[PDB]
Amino acid sequence: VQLVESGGGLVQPGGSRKLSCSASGFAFSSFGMHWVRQAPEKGLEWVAYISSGSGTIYYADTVKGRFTISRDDPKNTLFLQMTSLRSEDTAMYYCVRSIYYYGSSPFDFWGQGTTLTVSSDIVMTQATSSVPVTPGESVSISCRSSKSLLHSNGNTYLYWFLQRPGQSPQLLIYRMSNLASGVPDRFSGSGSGTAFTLTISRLEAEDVGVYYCMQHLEYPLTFGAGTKLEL
Amino acid sequence: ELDQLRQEAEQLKNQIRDARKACADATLSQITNNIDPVGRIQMRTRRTLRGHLAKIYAMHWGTDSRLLVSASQDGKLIIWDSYTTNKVHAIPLRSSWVMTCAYAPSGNYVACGGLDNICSIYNLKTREGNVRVSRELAGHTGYLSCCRFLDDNQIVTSSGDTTCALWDIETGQQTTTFTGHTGDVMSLSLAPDTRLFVSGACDASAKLWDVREGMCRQTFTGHESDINAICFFPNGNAFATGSDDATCRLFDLRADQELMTYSHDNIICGITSVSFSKSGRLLLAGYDDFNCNVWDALKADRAGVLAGHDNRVSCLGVTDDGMAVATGSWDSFLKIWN
Amino acid sequence: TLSAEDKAAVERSKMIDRNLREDGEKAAREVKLLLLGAGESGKSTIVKQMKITGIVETHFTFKDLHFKMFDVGGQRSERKKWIHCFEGVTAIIFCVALSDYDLVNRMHESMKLFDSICNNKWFTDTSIILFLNKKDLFEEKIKKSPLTICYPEYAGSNTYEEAAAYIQCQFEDLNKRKDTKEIYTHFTCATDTKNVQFVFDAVTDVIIKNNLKDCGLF
Amino acid sequence: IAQARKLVEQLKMEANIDRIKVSKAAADLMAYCEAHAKEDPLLTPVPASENPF
Amino acid sequence: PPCQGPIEIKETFKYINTVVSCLVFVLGIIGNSTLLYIIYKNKCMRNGPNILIASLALGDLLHIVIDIPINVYKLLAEDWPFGAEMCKLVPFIQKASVGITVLSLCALSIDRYRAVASWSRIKGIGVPKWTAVEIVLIWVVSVVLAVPEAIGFDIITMDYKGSYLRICLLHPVQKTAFMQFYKTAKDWWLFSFYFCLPLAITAFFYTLMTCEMLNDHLKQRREVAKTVFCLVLVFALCWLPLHLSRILKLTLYNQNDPNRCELLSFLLVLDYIGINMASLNSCINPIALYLVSKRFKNAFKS
Amino acid sequence: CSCSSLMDKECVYFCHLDIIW
């Protein structure tokens, strides 16, 4: 499986550009798609969402109308077309798959990411942004929210992501408790509405990066401030 | 010489019979009168699954007690959420003729068998996100009765070859073969300890086997017609069968005999699917007369009727949690009763 | 109410339901045929004509309707426990070889099987398609063999046409019902698709009859 | 003829089994049934607070 | 020009019509009720034609229930003691019921023609694609065409030469000019839309079905062709009289006819017979189901 | 039932004798 995005380049303010993403290794039609924007220095920000078979589309309030999206299932391709680009849109854009059923784990995979250069919300709160760590030491990362993330159905729609320096982030825990496939068991998470945490026991190498808490209770999908590890 | 062998066999059978009769000293009916009966039980319908367009032939619950797999003759088997009635997946089959569908305790694999003498295992939790066929356990020489998962690498199937087979998922050949039954088997059950399993065939007799060794330790008789469903008592020391005699005979493991038969003069059709409760005070039976009955597993009396279906109920399942019961009939309908 | 993920799950379920309905529509415009018969009863040649371990599904088509057949008699298994699975089949094809009328009582066993499948409780309405193979060699053998051997209670002229008519009528009389169940006979005319045309026309006729019955005009 | 040998060996193996008294089994079954009876949502109906439906 | 004026209903005709109407109404309601029960039990044979038959039975039962009691009681009191709302509502309901009945018959004809003319989607048990469109279209078109009578009739009390009237009539004088244009020749539209159009379409489609239709196969083809055409002929015979009576009292009525009084009396009796025969057609279709198909025959055998 | 005028003692009589239709 792999997502390869392209069609990104420097343009002028007020211009237009359309970026295409090609996916392979999996059933393109069975997965909903999302676009997310990583600022040149700041954290992630969700852009838009396309449902399975284009049945539903969601746009972030800052890019409504000015941005639009489409999917061509037969050739496993996604299109994000915008016009009248502002100078603030210069960032790196990622395409992410997500499938929603009982016991499913959306945001499973992440695109490579394409840079871009131009010349109501449930906010997620992270107390700190930089903490020094050493190998073999357990560390807890806390994250607060503007509202309780536990829904009446019993689920806590919270996700945690690690972005190592240089590459796309990956899902760490989904629904705040369940470990994803392929992630080590040393990670764990806990907490309650509007105040959650993630525990790393016996820290080792390759675990240094920026840690983000993201909410999926309702749209838009806001991210956390992001906590970075230091050695 | 051969007549001597026949005489020895019948003499041993008679000695077994008289030993059982000597060990038979009382009945459950004469003592269940002491304990009060439950009385009347009502199971109001809660959910109905309107997804199939053909008669279903098997259903099974998951260990999570929320997901259930239903297999219909339409050639597509569906995974259902009990709580929200959402079609999680609908796996097409290489052959629409399907008799059984098993669910792994870990839930990552689903077994399903049909008239091709092949039980296929599909893998659910996959990297690609699409449900593809993992394995096929061919080479059974006879239609499939039911497959049941022991572990994610062990499964026991029951074939029309009058045999049961313990295969290996990773390898693809049957490590253990169980035979001896005269007629073809039609149902199979696993004890909760997963150390012994029973089998019922058209011989009107049910025989249990040693999983570790691989041979049957004993057999029980007394039925009048073919056995279509067997359910193990939750304690793992007894069970009740079901035939086309409308008789839900009950047998014990440690007593090695039959306690009581469950026969009433109102119903004369067959028994399709038997089930127990978590407690074991009551059992459920889905007959061929379009309605499901719930007897007292100890008092041997009709404690109510579940008549929510307009056609024969091919299968029924009870949650291991004990919350609800799913009934699946030939009208392409699954109904949830709490 | 429902969360966003719940709404996504509901939409996915509805999409899968649309897929299921489309698949059922595709399979509904399709005719199911249950082919069965005794040992070496011509089924090998029948599938030979209709193409260009337990269930041998013959898949083919015609000008339309994409006929499907399910050979089940080739495998050796039980008699009447899986037969209820084929309930709702459009039509049943019966293939009996006429050259087995002398080899052994085989004709009697074939008649017993035909009676079994005809008065079967599940097959109350589905019509029956007969096929009589090796009719030419049947004529040769009845030229070389007498006719009362098959039926002691039957005597007549040892002529091919009267014997074929008599055996067809004898097979047809075995049913216990006529109003709902109909018997369609053939003679295995050569190796051409004329048999295929005949089965297509019979399927059309029975489809029309069942459709009228559903409409209440029959 | 060997099938007779197999059947008689199986039958005699099933013959030598240390079974227990029937009334003992009935009492044990009753005890198990009553021990888990009060925790049976079907035998004892549940108020509409733990009802998953 | 005053006539002698022996305009009245004979006692014997009233007496016989009472029992005739009671019997027809009872038979219709019981047949339609058992048809509804059997249709509901037909979840194995739930299909487009089944839904159409159920709709026809429901509309027919509603039509009989609304029409028969008040019309027959008019033979008793001939005073209409009911209020303005019922007075203005009843004719609209009866017209809508006749419309749904005739359109249901048309839908039955088109479905039972496409049964042998459209043997492409040969199967499918359940709710079809666009039959639900047709049934709702029929339901809305019935009221869409029957609305003017909901604003046409009105109670007005005249001092007759010997009595005080309670006439719930289509007023000769009304405000809306479209209403006057409607009522000037309303019987023409009634006859056309309720008899000629349904009879024409039904006969057209059944004749097409018979043409596409042509051993026991041909005998059954002839039997079914006879059945559908006999049903159509019975419908036509039973629905001629009402429209014919309305037309005769419309155009053959003169303004200075000394004999017209007697004439009018005859029309009166004819009118009654017509509506009775109308309800008779209402009850005819269920019996046709029993006397044709073994399925509904054994269903009635319950 | 319907009439042309409000002066015809006969057509109103017919309407009183007419059915609801």
Question: What would you say this structure looks like, in words?
Answer:
The complex is a heterohexamer of chains A (231), B (338), C (218), D (53), E (302) and F (21). Chain A has strands spanning 2-6, 17-24, 32-38, 44-50, 57-59, 67-72, 77-82, 92-98, 114-115, 124-125, 130-132, 139-145, 158-163, 170-174, 178-179, 187-192, 195-200, 210-215, 227-230. Chain A contains no helices and 19 strands. Chain A has a 6-stranded mixed sheet, with no helix packed on it. In chain A, strands 5-4-3-8-9 form a 5-stranded antiparallel sheet, with no helix packed on it. In chain A, strands 1-2-7-6 form a 4-stranded antiparallel sheet, with no helix packed on it. Chain C has one domain: P-loop containing nucleotide triphosphate hydrolases (Rossmann fold). A 6-stranded mixed sheet of chain C has the order 2-3-1-4-5-6, with helices on both faces. In chain C, helix 3 links the parallel strand 4 (91-97) and strand 5. Chain E has one domain: Rhopdopsin 7-helix transmembrane proteins (Up-down Bundle). Helix content of chain E is 74%, strand content 4%. In chain E, strand 2 (159-160) and strand 3 (163-164) form a beta hairpin. Chains in contact: A-B, A-C, B-C, B-D, B-E, C-E, E-F. Chains B and D meet through helix 1 and strand 17 of B and helix 1 and helix 2 of D.
CATH topology of chain C: Rossmann fold
- The CATH H-level superfamily of chain C is P-loop containing nucleotide triphosphate hydrolases
Number of strands of chain C: 6
Strand order of the largest sheet of chain E: 1-4
Percent strand of chain E: under 5%
CATH H level of chain E: which superfamily? Rhodopsin 7-helix transmembrane proteins
Assigned CATH architecture of chain C: 3-Layer(aba) Sandwich
Distance between the termini of chain E: 62 Å
Oligomeric grouping of the chains: heterohexamer
N-to-C SSE series of chain C? HEHEEEHEHHEH
Domains of chain E, number? 1
Query: What is the number of domains of chain C?
Result: 1
β-strand number of chain E: 4
List keywords for this structure.
heterohexamer, C: 218 residues, alpha/beta, Rossmann fold, 6-stranded mixed sheet, 6 helices, 13% strand, F: 21 residues, mainly alpha, 33% helix, flat, acetylation (chain D), cell membrane (chain D), lipoprotein (chain D), transducer (chain D), Guanine nucleotide-binding protein G(I)/G(S)/G(O) subunit gamma-2 (chain D)
Summarize the structure.
The complex is a heterohexamer of chains A (231), B (338), C (218), D (53), E (302) and F (21). Chain B is mainly β.
Summarize the topology.
The complex is a heterohexamer of chains A (231), B (338), C (218), D (53), E (302) and F (21).
Chain A: E1 2-6, E2 17-24, E3 32-38, E4 44-50, E5 57-59, E6 67-72, E7 77-82, E8 92-98, E9 114-115, E10 124-125, E11 130-132, E12 139-145, E13 158-163, E14 170-174, E15 178-179, E16 187-192, E17 195-200, E18 210-215, E19 227-230
Parallel strand pairs in A: 11-19
Antiparallel strand pairs in A: 1-2, 2-7, 3-4, 3-8, 4-5, 6-7, 8-9, 10-12, 12-17, 13-14, 13-18, 14-15, 16-17, 18-19
Chain D: H1 2-15, H2 22-35
Chain E: H1 11-41, H2 48-74, H3 84-117, H4 131-150, E1 153-156, E2 159-160, E3 163-164, E4 167-170, H5 177-184, H6 186-213, H7 216-251, H8 260-290, H9 294-300
Antiparallel strand pairs in E: 1-4, 2-3
Helix pairs in contact in E: 1-2, 1-8, 2-3, 2-8, 3-4, 3-6, 6-7, 7-8
